[PDB]
Amino acid sequence: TDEDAPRVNYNDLGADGVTTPVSDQEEAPSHSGVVSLNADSYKIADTVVITVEDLDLNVDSDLIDIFTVVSD
Amino acid sequence: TPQTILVGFSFASIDIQPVTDEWTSGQEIPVVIVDADQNKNSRADEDLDLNNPDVTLIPAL
C-alpha cells in the first residue's frame, strides 16, 4: 500500500513533444481472514459447515478456487 | 477465458403429497423426489431402473 502500491508505468509523447511518462497505481491490501461456524452447539452428525471469508485466497476470477486436504 | 466444472452432490427431499387430507384406499397420489445427483444428463430424461447398474439409488418401501 501507500508508496509501494502496484503502479503501472507508460511513457508517452505529449502534445508538446516531450516524452513525459504517465503512471497510475492501485493499492492491493490484505484482509483478516474470519472463520466461523453456523451454530454454537452441534449434535451428532449435525453437518457442521465452515465458512471462511478472506478475499486474499482468490487466485483467479475465472476458475473456482478450491483447497483439498492433505493425505500423507 | 477458461471455465471450470465443479463436482458436487446435493441434499434430496422425498415428499408424499396426497390429493386431500386423507390417504384413503384406491387413491394414486404423486411421489416427488428432488435429487440432482440422479440428473446425470442435462439434454435428456433420466428414468430410474433396478435393471440399470448406473442408477445406483432407488427409493423403496
Q: Which amino acid is at B48?
A: L
Strands A34-37 and A21-25: unpaired
- Is the four-CA dihedral B34, B35, B38, B42 of positive or negative sign? positive
Residue A8, classed as helix, strand or coil, is strand
Q: Which amino acid is at A30?
A: S
Resolution (A): 3.4
Other C-beta atoms closer than 10 Å to the C-beta of A51 total 9
Interface contact A62, partner B, CB < 8 A: yes
Interface contact A59, partner B, CB < 8 A: no
Q: Nearest 5 degrees, angle CA A61-CA A63-CA A67? A: 105
Q: At which residue does the C-alpha cell 442435462 appear? A: B42
How far from B7 is each of A3, A32, B19, B55, CA to CA, in Å? 43, 29, 37, 18
Q: Do B6 and A62 touch (CB under 8 A)?
A: no
CA B60 to chain centre: 12
